[PDB]
């Protein structure tokens, strides 16, 4: 059994990883965190994601925890989460991060002292959006050369960063099985006389909507045909369960950046 | 019987407009126009669009087949289609625009003149289209105060404009609906940190791909549901057919300024 | 204020329901019923939706909670629903059903014994279906006469009955818009050789899948455009709502048979 | 260089094919065919296509034509095809063949004469849908084993056949990968009270409306996620070019059953 800290307990991931430790038998909720400011600093775990009082509760300090657990689960804000990694590098603590829309020096920064932590990162915890990634490897050796290629993504109206790190993910993905860096096509944006499309681009759409979990859809266009390589979300549940899966993957093993893809056997 | 000219006869539009006039029985091609440096000009008419030899060439400029013709069709580009606008004010000449993506100034021109010429103008002749825009009416009367409001497009590699004319007479058919105005709330870009969405933004996604003649979704999101308005087009025939009904429907009609809605009757 | 039963406490929407019941301020959850076979008779309604405690449990028949109630709020199974049906008649309570896949036979049943009952009954209780009824309206008058008209509805794995209600409410509105019967047009089924498609048919695709909430479209479809109109459901809570508004809206009305469309205005 | 015969070349696909060859300069177009008692038997192949006079003439009957072509390319109706593979037979001609919604019988014919003639045949001459098969392939290895797995597809009002071949072909892709066979699992019809959604089933649904080119969409649903393989044709051409490819590729070879997928190197 791995024992398992819950930052940012009181989110809308937050909420979904408690519930999901609670559920995975071969991991124990042992700790959850706020914000300072959080009027949920105090209440236990359990009463907070309907599954009634898990004699746990949280606190606005993980460092006053850390002899209750192992491996914290990390889907909060990129400060907070760095944070934590150097909470992990001072304690002998593995983290797995779902946190995205990290600027390139925090990004860094984690694979540098990733080096020294066992951690793992993803944008994505499902394993949908992880075999994904794979089809679209493929799609863009066989297509990706000749054809115009597209990402559109839609989430719920309270995320923050655009588009989402899968959406940037699958550009990657793409970009990479063709030899070239994303920031040398992608294309975020078209508004007046864009001109026709340069052959190359990849364009980004992103919508934001009601409570959208999250669609992400790859496509691939030729003059008459197109493949379009899709992902729905329909449950936050979908990431906590990979993301609980990862954790209990992730303890005891050595420092390293490990993925999603690592974890699933990809 | 109406007489019709075809601008830019070699167009995508032109091509079509042409095929759809000689398909009418009731309207004529009679006159085609193409750029004055275009190495299509002095070519038939109907050897351009798969129908065999019509009799009729492509000349450089309309003003030299004024009494062929009752009614100029135009899907081409801004200026061009001015110039046609001052050759109907000129000569007592009819005309049916499709062009999109004008400036405010050469809008206020169109609206000026078509006080003295016979005009109908719309960003898109199909009849699909032209519900939609009354189906939307109706959707933000019931859901618009409370929900998101998202307009997608997609269009094939070689249009111009971002977004498309359709998707901004949807923003504009929702946003009159309720009261608005587009300007004062739609957002047509979203890169980075975005914060919240906003309750009453519009959001405009825009997609180019392809060979893709037009998609157009206009999505109301509450929490729980959303309401997705959708019009798929598939053959250019189907804005071509429509403007040559249009065309047939203005001849002999008083100087106005008529839209596809007035034409079909919505 | 009025008092709620909620019939089948411990299904999908039965959770729902009392949860929407508790948090609507006014109306009260005041009973529950189960299966007598099923294990959760005897626990408490709060700790079945992650409520907590209310001091109210689920009985297996809601006869011995007469006292405690005013509506039935029915989301459970045709037979199950008909007893509570009787159950309002002979003790002067009220019924909201949501139940679907009801015979013809039983559907007579409702129908007569609604002259004496007061009777909320509907395929679907979310607002956005609701107004794609009348859209649905709205676009057969304008495109039903020539266009082929295609229904296709994607549910959750554990649905029994196909297709869904709603999708049968929607072919009904639009061929009622149409002066025909749906029973005259529609098809259920494709295999083989069929031919080519009639004129005249509604076909109806069914997808079941995963836990989707529920996907409904309707597609309006001419050679080169078609028009599509799509309701997504995402959370089981904009049934609830709108059946416990239905109940709240039902109290002291007169016996009649009343539909959502009705409890809205529209 | 190959000559090419195209079968029932007034037809859909026909007309797109004799323009395709063509266009294709390492192809030619050498004789086209109808039944005896079309109209357009005696019109020149050109003017069926809006390319002008070919000098060629279509026979209702390729043995008159025998001298003129190498491979027939046969879109056209089930019994009509085996005609045509017989005449292979006879006179050591190739065949590329496109027509779908042949029997099981009828199949095992063309297995048989395949082992005597060159023979290409696949239910879709797109990339794109070639690419799909090997998705399918990865994704059911990955999440088949415990996903639902549905089948959508439309197509335009004139399809005879549901599904259609390549729907087929993609359950076919599916079960081969998971050790299953079609037949076992497939399910083709939802009507009625079906109960519950059984594991291994594919369930097939069929859209039957307007020009739709074809979609076809593979859907693996889990509990809060899925990721849908989607494959959308908008030109008839996106067939007619791969089938002139083969055609192409087929020249000379010797006899055996070739797919589509040899043609590419998948
Ligand atoms: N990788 C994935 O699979 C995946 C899935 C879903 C969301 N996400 C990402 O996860 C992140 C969180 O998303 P969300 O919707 O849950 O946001 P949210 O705002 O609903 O939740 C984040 C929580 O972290 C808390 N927090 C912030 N700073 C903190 C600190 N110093 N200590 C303790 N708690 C703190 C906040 O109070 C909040 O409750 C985002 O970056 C999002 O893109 C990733
Ligand atoms: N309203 C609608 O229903 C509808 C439908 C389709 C396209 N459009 C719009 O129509 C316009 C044309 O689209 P397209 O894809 O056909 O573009 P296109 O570039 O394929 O065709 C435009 C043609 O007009 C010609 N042209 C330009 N200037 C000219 C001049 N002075 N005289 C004669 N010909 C001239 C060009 O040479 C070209 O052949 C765009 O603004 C587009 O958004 C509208
Ligand atoms: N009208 C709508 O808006 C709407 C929305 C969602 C679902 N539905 C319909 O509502 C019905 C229920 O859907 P569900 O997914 O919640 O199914 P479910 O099987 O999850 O829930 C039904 C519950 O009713 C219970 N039940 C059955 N017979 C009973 C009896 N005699 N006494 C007490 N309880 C009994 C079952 O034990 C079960 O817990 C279905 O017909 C479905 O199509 C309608
Ligand atoms: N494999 C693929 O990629 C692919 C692509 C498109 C269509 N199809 C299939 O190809 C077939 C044809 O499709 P379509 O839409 O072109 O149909 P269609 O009816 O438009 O065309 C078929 C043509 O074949 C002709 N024909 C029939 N019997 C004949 C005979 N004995 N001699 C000469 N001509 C004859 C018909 O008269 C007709 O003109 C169908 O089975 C369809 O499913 C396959
Ligand atoms: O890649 C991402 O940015 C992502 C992935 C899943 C959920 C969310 C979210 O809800 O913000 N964001
Ligand atoms: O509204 C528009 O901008 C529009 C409508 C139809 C076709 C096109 C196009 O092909 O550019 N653009
Ligand atoms: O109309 C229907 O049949 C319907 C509507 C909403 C949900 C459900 C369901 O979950 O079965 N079914
Ligand atoms: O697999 C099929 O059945 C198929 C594939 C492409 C086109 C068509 C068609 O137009 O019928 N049918």
Redesign the interface.
């Known amino acids: 059994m791995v024992r398992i800290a819950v930052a940012g307990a009181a989110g809308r991931m937050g909420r979904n990883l408690v519930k999901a430790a609670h559920h995975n038998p071969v991991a124990k909720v042992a700790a959850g965190s706020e914000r300072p400011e959080s009027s949920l600093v105090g209440v236990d775990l359990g ?1 907070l ?4 009082k898990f004699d746990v509760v949280v606190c606005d300090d993980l460092a006053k925890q850390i002899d209750q657990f192992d491996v914290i689960i990390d889907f909060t804000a990129p400060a907070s989460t760095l944070n934590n990694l150097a909470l992990c590098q001072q304690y002998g603590k593995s983290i797995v991060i779902g946190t995205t ?1 990290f600027t390139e020096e925090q990004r860094e920064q984690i694979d540098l002292v990733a080096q020294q932590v066992p951690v793992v990162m993803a944008p994505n915890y ?4 992880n ?2 990634f ?2 679209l490897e ?2 863009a050796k ?2 990706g050369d000749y ?2 290629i ?1 990402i ?1 993504e839609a989430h719920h ?2 995320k ?4 989402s790190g899968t959406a940037i993910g699958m550009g990657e993905a793409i970009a990479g099985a063709m030899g070239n860096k994303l920031s040398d096509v992608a294309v ?10 340069t052959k190359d681009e990849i ?1 980004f ?9 999250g669609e992400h859809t790859a ?20 990431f906590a ?1 990979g993301a609980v899966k990862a954790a209990v993957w992730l303890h005891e093993k050595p420092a390293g950046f490990y993925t999603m893809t690592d974890v699933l056997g ?1």
Not at 49 to 52: D, M, S, T, Y
Request: aromatic letters at 2%; proline letters at 1%.
């Open positions: 009463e994601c309907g599954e009634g829309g499902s394993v949908g959006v075999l994904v794979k089809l493929k799609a066989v297509m054809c115009d597209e559109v109206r309270h923050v960063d655009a588009p975020y944006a078209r508004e007046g006389i864009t001109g026709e499309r364009g759409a992103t919508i934001r909507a009601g409570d959208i979990v496509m691939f266009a030729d003059i008459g045909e197109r493949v379009e390589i899709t992902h729905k979300a329909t449950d936050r549940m979908t369960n990809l």
